[PDB]
Structures are given as structure tokens and as C-alpha cells.
Ligand binder design. Sequence first.
Ligand SMILES: CC(C)(C)O[C@H](C(=O)O)c1c(-c2ccc3c(c2)CCCO3)nc(-c2ccccc2)c2ccccc12
Ligand SMILES: CC(C)(C)O[C@H](C(=O)O)c1c(-c2ccc3c(c2)CCCO3)nc(-c2ccccc2)c2ccccc12
Lengths: 135, 135
Amino acid sequence: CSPGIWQLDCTHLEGKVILVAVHVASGYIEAEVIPAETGQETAYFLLKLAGRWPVKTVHTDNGSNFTSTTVKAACWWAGIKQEFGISMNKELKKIIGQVRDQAEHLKTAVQMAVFIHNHKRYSAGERIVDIIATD
Amino acid sequence: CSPGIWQLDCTHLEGKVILVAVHVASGYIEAEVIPAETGQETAYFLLKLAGRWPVKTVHTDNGSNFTSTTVKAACWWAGIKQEFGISMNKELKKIIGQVRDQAEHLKTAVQMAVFIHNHKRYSAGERIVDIIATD
Ligand SMILES: CC(C)(C)O[C@H](C(=O)O)c1c(-c2ccc3c(c2)CCCO3)nc(-c2ccccc2)c2ccccc12
Ligand SMILES: CC(C)(C)O[C@H](C(=O)O)c1c(-c2ccc3c(c2)CCCO3)nc(-c2ccccc2)c2ccccc12
């Protein structure tokens, strides 16, 4: 797809919420554990994501994720539109299970699993910077 | 400098702690507000940073930041060494003050200020991906 397209979804694990952003063209992932599955957490996460990468459009598998006033406000300010042109969430949950006993906190296992996914082979982390630099 | 070198420091504002990571060769920044200025917060932040970028060595202006058992453990697992070869923290505090009234929460102003710094002109965000892709 286009180099500005990202997909955001939440998954549940251990009674906690993991927000997962996937750069669609590359397979590169950012993820965080958030306390509540709310618009404000999504909005804040979008602000962080857009200061780091050139985010043009965002997609989701649960469209009601984006009806927040706060989400719309974050997308407005960062100049993000909704992607209309369109499972690495399962692989990530798989890597988390593989490392989970290595960490006390779930959020630590998540970041270990993001690390492994992005540097596993080129890797998704190498592909994203090549795609963005070329563009 | 080398494309794997990052500098981590905390600043204080409104009685809160802002962890600031600077990619030295490019001037690109990641930042978060953390509750406490502790080793565990630094360790977790390093894990996140290293899953996103190829982090080889980290520098700091307060060396005692890195004496944590947890920090050493994060650097060990992510394969990060201490940089021995070596103020955008003030510019960032300046941009934060410029936007602070736009946001209820400090952490939101921080991310607005990271966004502005990284896309201000090439921009630091364009330079980091070119440097990393070339390398
Ligand atoms: C990441 C934080 C610090 C927020 O939480 C860790 C966790 O959830 O396990 C955590 C770690 C730690 C640090 C880096 C690390 C790993 C574990 C796993 C692989 C990647 O790199 N270490 C210790 C500990 C400190 C003193 C002695 C023995 C262990 C922790 C102690 C209490 C709570 C979390 C710890
Ligand atoms: C980012 C979060 C949501 C965690 O906190 C914001 C803040 O700290 O100001 C926040 C925002 C918001 C959202 C996006 C945004 C800005 C502000 C500033 C520029 C960049 O994009 N909006 C509202 C609000 C919601 C309904 C109606 C009127 C405003 C907030 C309401 C309460 C607390 C924080 C809000």
C-alpha cells in the first residue's frame, strides 16, 4: 500500500489493553499497554505516532474506535485522514506468549515482542525506513 | 556522529518528569512524561526505543541515570552499550511553553512539541530515516 497508511487496533490480554499500530506497507509495529480502551488513549497514541512517522491515513478493524471527539481532534491537529482503501496482531500475541515468562510486567513482554517482530528478517524495521526515505 | 548513538535525559516541568531521547546524528526526538524519575522507567523506555530504531549506544548528561540494575538488564537484552565518544532539550522546553495553553495535559503538549520539532525544517524526521536507510 501507500507509505503513509497505518492500522490501529486494540487487543486484550491478562485483562489489559494493548494498542497495536501497524505500518501497512512494511509490517513494522508500535505497541503500548494502555489502562482503558478509550478515545483519549487512542488520541494521545495518535499524537505520539504522528510526531515519529509521516502519518497520512489511519485504518482500523473497529471503525467505532475513531468516533471520539478527542480522536477526531488529534487527527485534525496532526493532519491525519481516515484510510478508505483497505493478521500480524496474532503473530504479536504469539511472540508475547513465547517471552511472557521472561518479564514480570505484561507491558515489558509486549515491548520485547515488538523488538523481536521489528528486527526479525530485510526486517520490518529496515523496510519502514527504506520505504519512507525513498518516498 | 554514528547512526546508532542516542542521548537520554530527563527534564522537569510542572512537577513532572519528561524523558527525552535524541538521535544524535539527526536531531530527531522521542519523549514521554513518566511519573517517577526511576531506573525502571528508564529501562522500559530503552526497551521501547530499541524495538523502533537500531540503538547501538546510549549517552546521557547524568551518568548515574544508568547505574540501575533494571537499566543494565534492558541494555543487556537489547544489546545496547554505553557511548563513550561524546541543547535541543531547551528548544523542546521552548516549544512546549509555546503550545502549553493548547492542551489540558502536559504530556499532550510534549507530544505536540515533539511533532513540531521533528517535522520543522530537511526536517529531523526526514534526516533520521535517510541516515538509517543509508547505513
Ligand atoms: C522493564 C521494567 C523494569 C519496567 O519491568 C521489568 C519486567 O516487567 O520484568 C523488570 C526487569 C526487567 C528489566 C529489563 C528487561 C527485563 C526485565 C526482561 C527482558 C528485557 O529487559 N527487571 C527487574 C529486576 C530488577 C532487579 C533485579 C531483578 C529483576 C524487575 C523487577 C521488578 C519489576 C519489574 C522488573
Ligand atoms: C490528548 C488527550 C486526549 C489525552 O488529552 C488532551 C489534552 O491534554 O488537551 C484532550 C483533548 C485533545 C485531543 C487532541 C488534541 C489536543 C487536545 C490538543 C492538540 C492536539 O490534539 N481534547 C479534549 C476534549 C475532549 C472533548 C471536548 C473538548 C476537548 C480533552 C478533554 C479532557 C482532557 C484532555 C483532552
